[PDB]
């Protein structure tokens, strides 16, 4: 007790209910006066309770189906029949098999143009130029050449082959258009734009690895290094470890022994998106994202019979799925500086060399005339259908008594934009709207000329590439006269080098939407709010484990229900307003020089009759 506990557990009420029921049962002549669990549960909940209810008998089995449209190819329409098997059919997934493929043989391209104006030489293996400076005595030499990973110089016009890679998420872009046909008319359909909105919003981490494996995305692999820290020792030489100045203070910049024993982890990827000489056979199981994937919403076969039900997949072109990438061929850019102090200093004939410096980078380079194989075959494509069976007695009752089923459908509109601000009528909305995926994707993300299209195609922002360099630094000193003391002498030579150890590319996102406003039949559904309200807050607050806060900085969620993703309706936009629906945007990026696509994918409510 007391007051707080009477309202949370009501244990004095519960006991009085027990005393009352046991007496009424004794009054009425029951052999066993002890109450029923149901009688207790009419007011109180039983936290420990192993009760369950039997389910009407039901089992499921998957089935595989080849298409009606002959041998599968890229850039073609593939249609499946939905065979007659179970009383209902439910979740679907399509196995796509793409042949192992390599690029055709090419050549080592021509060397770059001269950099320096002096001492210009061009051979089959290098291009050399120089800049003189007689004032400072520094002679700068530029050398550029092609090498492989081992550093062996490659000859111009000799053999060289590009690698091949897939775009990111090839399973999502391959199905250009997925549609469910019932009696000629599309019952529901979606595009790759709806598939990547699912990719951003509806794949939590406990499903992410398999999702990636399902649609052909490579999965990172964690790799452990040697020990980098070992307690009570150091990799640094003794002369720089644990120094103190003349005052007894520990020296800033003097390393001390490690306090822990630790090793590094790093992640490597070597899948379909990593360029390879041969991309081995790619097997994807692309799920079809239809409402009836939920078992409860399985579609009765009698209400949509065989012969009038089809799955139709439009297949993208190979040029948007498979790309070339640099192979074992690199451009080595090397700068050498020779500071001389004697006669002819700053030129090739200068004497008295005191300081030498070398700077060397490596850039992966494409081979000339090495392209993807246009004969790569779609080796297999098959539709997997989950078929649900029930007893004849319950099927009869269910078909006569269910009436209808609520369904959800995709409604998509793409609007090419060159305005920094615009009010775009959403003319595709027939039905009540639960929520809307919004995006302003730059046209350059899907441009053939964009060398990073394999990556940018699904991003909803303008992406720029920022290099991050690993640099190896070296120093060397040498005495060239054994009779002169080195310290303070020009016989004590200096040498240094900066060599590129590796290079990363950081994708830097520039958002294309600043503010979004929603107006419908003269009614403000959303005031002009920053894009971060729809990308961060709304996916964070709503949806529970069914709505993921998107990684993409350009993915916006226009919510109109309380529980997006759940079957029970919880809010929508009335059809009257949906028929005059406007999305007003503000952009810092879109203009006449930067076209962008206002992508809006709505999820609408619709009914479906039975029997």
């Amino acid at each position: 007790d007391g007051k707080a506990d009477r309202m949370i557990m009501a244990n004095d009420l519960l006991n009085d209910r027990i005393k009352s029921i046991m007496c009424l049962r004794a009054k009425q002549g029951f052999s066993d006066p002890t109450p029923t669990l149901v009688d207790i549960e009419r007011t109180h909940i039983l936290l420990i309770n192993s009760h369950y209810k039997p389910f009407a008998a039901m089992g499921y089995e998957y089935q595989k189906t080849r298409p009606n449209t002959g041998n599968p190819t890229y850039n073609s329409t593939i249609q499946f029949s939905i065979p007659q098997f179970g009383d209902f059919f439910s979740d679907m997934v399509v196995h796509v098999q793409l042949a192992a493929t390599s690029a055709s043989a090419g050549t080592v391209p021509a060397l770059p143009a001269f950099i320096g104006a002096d001492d210009q030489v061009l051979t089959s293996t290098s291009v050399v130029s120089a800049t003189e400076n007689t004032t400072s005595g520094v002679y700068t030499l530029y050398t550029q050449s092609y090498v492989n990973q081992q550093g062996t110089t490659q000859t111009v016009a000799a053999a060289a082959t590009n690698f091949v890679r897939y775009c990111e998420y090839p399973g999502l872009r391959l199905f250009k258009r997925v549609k469910f046909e019932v009696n000629g008319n599309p019952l529901d359909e979606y595009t790759a734009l709806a598939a990547i909105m699912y990719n951003k919003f509806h794949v939590p981490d406990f499903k992410l690895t398999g999702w990636k494996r399902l649609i052909g995305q490579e999965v990172p692999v964690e790799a452990a290094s040697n020990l980098v820290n070992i307690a009570s020792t150091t990799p640094w030489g003794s002369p720089i470890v644990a120094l103190s100045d003349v005052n007894g203070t520990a020296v800033t910049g003097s390393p001390v022994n490690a306090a822990i024993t630790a090793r590094k982890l790093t992640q490597v990827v070597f899948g379909a998106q990593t360029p390879k000489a041969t991309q081995e056979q790619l097997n994807m199981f692309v799920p079809l994202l239809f409402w009836f994937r939920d078992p409860r919403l399985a579609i009765a076969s009698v209400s949509i019979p065989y012969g009038q039900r089809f799955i139709t997949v439009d297949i993208e072109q190979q040029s948007n799925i498979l790309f070339t990438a640099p192979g074992n061929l690199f451009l080595q850019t090397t700068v050498e500086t020779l500071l001389t102090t004697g006669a002819g200093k700053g030129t090739a004939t200068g004497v008295l060399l005191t300081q030498y410096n070398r700077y060397t980078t490596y850039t992966p380079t494409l081979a000339s005339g090495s392209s993807i194989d246009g004969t790569q075959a779609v080796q297999n494509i098959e539709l997997y259908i989950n078929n649900i069976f029930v007893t004849p007695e319950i099927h009869d009752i269910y078909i006569k008594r269910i009436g209808f089923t609520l369904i959800r459908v995709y409604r998509e509109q793409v609007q090419r934009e060159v305005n920094a601000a615009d009010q775009v009528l959403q003319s595709q909305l027939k039905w009540p709207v639960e929520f809307i995926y919004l995006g302003l994707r730059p046209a350059n993300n899907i441009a053939a000329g964009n060398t990073y299209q394999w990556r940018d195609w699904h991003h909803l922002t303008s992406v720029t590439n920022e290099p991050v360099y690993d640099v190896s630094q070296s120093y060397a000193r040498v005495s060239i006269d054994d009779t002169v003391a080195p310290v303070g002498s020009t016989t004590f030579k200096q040498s240094a080098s900066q060599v590129m150890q590796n290079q990363y590319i950081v994708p830097v996102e520039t958002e294309t939407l600043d503010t979004v406003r929603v107006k419908a039949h003269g009614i403000e559904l959303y005031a002009q709010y920053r894009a971060q309200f729809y990308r961060d807050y709304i996916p964070w607050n709503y949806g529970s484990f069914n709505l993921v806060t998107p990684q993409d900085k350009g993915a916006l969620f226009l919510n109109f229900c309380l529980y997006p993703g759940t079957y029970q309706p919880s809010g929508h936009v009335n059809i009257s307003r949906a028929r005059e629906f406007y999305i007003e945007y503000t952009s810092s990026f879109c203009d006449s020089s930067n076209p962008c696509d206002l992508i809006s994918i709505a999820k609408c409510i619709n009914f479906l009759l039975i029997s």
Copy 2:
């Protein structure tokens, strides 16, 4: 496939198809004799015993719609270190989730100077200029002459002059939106209906943000998100970056040589993670935009607060704003201390000194340390450019609203109750005097006082940690070697004309935040009666958040975050256990510490979520 509905005892208990078919036979026979035209049963008839796993049924909801609304403060121009009060406008029939948009101006550090150079290291040949400090240690017994050089450079390596211009970078503390709200208060009629501090905001950060909400959560409160970056190919199948002379060697006995690299088997590239947001030091931190959610109970739509139930005269959201000195910090910019040690091994006359002849071996060691510029601090004039309260307003039909007010009676609510007790004891029993309602659970921690100290150069990071964090360096070192013959007429092998040179240069340095836990054991006692026996802190940090809560309870990353649980479903609305106070008068949390003493004071932080009731 054939369905088998009745196979023995197991199927009879799980599906009960014989009974289901008997119920159908009975129901169709009764309906037929009672005069119905359609004897087939209703779906409810079947649902009274059996569940239908295929079922498209749903219920219509009482008509409902919602719309957000911006609201500005009653307290004028917003500033750091101030109290900001919002009115809760009269708009919807109910109001639910709330979020505050905060806009912090772009800011830079003031102009400063390159500080003075470090003191001499060696006792010999001391020279100090405006650009370097040089000293040396002689050793004529070994013939090794050690030269110490320290100087200031930028990233490109150009030497910077002492007292020349230099400017520090600026950074925001980690999770600045969580620290910015010193206190958040929802008050009606002068008294706080519920309130919480930044300690509750970080308790939420550790226990209630799973990964499918994290990226958006980090963006809402100003924490930078890592960005994955891909490298060049590091392994290419059938080749190697190692030079031929060392690749694929065998010894004289035919065995492959240990340490001889072979060709790669796969073609792989590396992934690295980079950050460049509010927590990364920058010359100019761009304008910071945050949408801080208010972690109140009524964020749940089911618990939306009826507008007529609270007068408009005295209903407010009141937020105390942290000071700028706890949110924005200076950090080293494009300025680095270069520490170089050089050893020269000579063998002739004067060996070990600067005049020794015949140099046989040379070594160079060099590190770089980011350095603060003198007199370059944060801009104190940084403006809080905008702050606005977003309130979700829910609208219902007039009929349901009138029914709801007259029939709801009350609502069950959850509130925060905070207590912080300063400790210098390794073990103590702390009476929890702010705990006074049915408590579902208690967040517990023992945060060292140094984590929030202005003297801690890592306060921007340590402030929300509940442990003692020390910084262990990890070094990336570039090793180089070189040999050169200075006499073209003498064979190099075995001659002192075959010189030696080597170098170790710091490529990069990482900082490993090493947590030393402050709690060894925890005990929960109420009136000389154990609610929790003395268990290791790892029982409350790892096991309880692992077993309970489902997706509502996240196993905390912080090694010091503990969860004292008293219910079966910590995240759900339905009550499932509590400790009432009630006889909880003498509620004690007893701890043991291997860290807390007179030299390392800590704050025992205990935040409980309690059940209370609001009458509508």
Copy 3:
């Protein structure tokens, strides 16, 4: 402006014209029936419509829980033994269980530095106690190739052969999962339920989402990554590259490909480090684990009535793995230095050790961690403590006697495991362990070498269900150096302009590359196809993705397959099963590209079956 009644669409989703009619009716009946208040009841509305704003809850039959820890009946615990706990009489019910295991801090015994490797070259062979040197002459090219191998510590100091050296120690991955060979819940001498480490690793792969992973790893003694940030690598408007190569343009004005430019952003790198039980250390700290017991009655709803399983005949029995499968030797602070030097001379005796005019020098240096001879694990490492923690649930006496007299029975889930060793590339394996309805089956074909003592990666591969090979990734430091040895002749184009270059291994990573052992799987029971022959990715990737929601995690292990037969794996409510008639003649058929007589594998099949438990 709410609408509520816009067309047929709003009629079927909200049914507001129907609800208004129900309210208007209910008010008139109550008015006609003489009620004081005619406004309807929330239950009256909810008979048709769902209320999205509803603070309703039900009171729970009073309950509370408390944990209790007990010691084994079998005295001091050791490796390779059976430990048995009694379940003490405490609460009305007992629920989740977790076992605290404490393993003493441990280190390897003292050993020696092993013998140096054999000669590589055929010429100029020298064997020291500190290095082994050989060479390969080449008079045609003028290249003298010198091979040197030695032993060093991390700092690089040379270690003498047969001098002192000690190995480090490491724990296998997921030690808490392998430590328990078998875990038994025993009643009346009969095993009521039991599982092995194989079931534990199946749970580790399929039922630990990311919001529970950190705590899960800490419970079973797996080290947790620690994120560490570096110095700024990019700084806006500057570069680490020296100016001679920065922002170059060719003679035509075009920017030079390969010429770096200033950075556009300012960024740090994030790397991850581990330093726990799996990282080799001179001394591993005292390992403390709280290993949960993965029985069905962990669910609070499914707590076991203390009366229904009497005291004195109920036990938890745990078989403990041998020490040699839990704790392993790993290389310590001893490294094999492999150095190749090439000397390009052109004068008399070129290509031999007597070459004169040295033009180019190259050094290639790798390091390989090396085991010390005679340094092994401490076989006297004690199990310092092991205790079983049991949650005890207390309920009111009135509800206790009612529930025990009325619940009848409870559904339980039990493990049923079979391991079939295979050398056949394809086989059809009868599952004799299956006797009861099966919800789903964890499947794998684990290579026998993953648990073989001869495998030096057994500490890692034991829980993997594929064949793992080790692919090195090398971080290589490249350096160049040029020096003029004659100050009277111009360096350019002269043999006095000497060249030197070095490649030194900076670090090396091991990539675990998984080779799948299962190609296709087919499920055939009672001559009936429940699963056709489908690729292994259907069971590994598609099924865990589609089913189970947050209760079924997609497995990272490429060899983990999930054969599902219910709609909702992870829920207590039954949702489908394989019936007993078919379960008694049950076949799992596989095809393999890996398994043959040179690579024996174990087909591991662990099914979750449904059984029942009577009450008392």
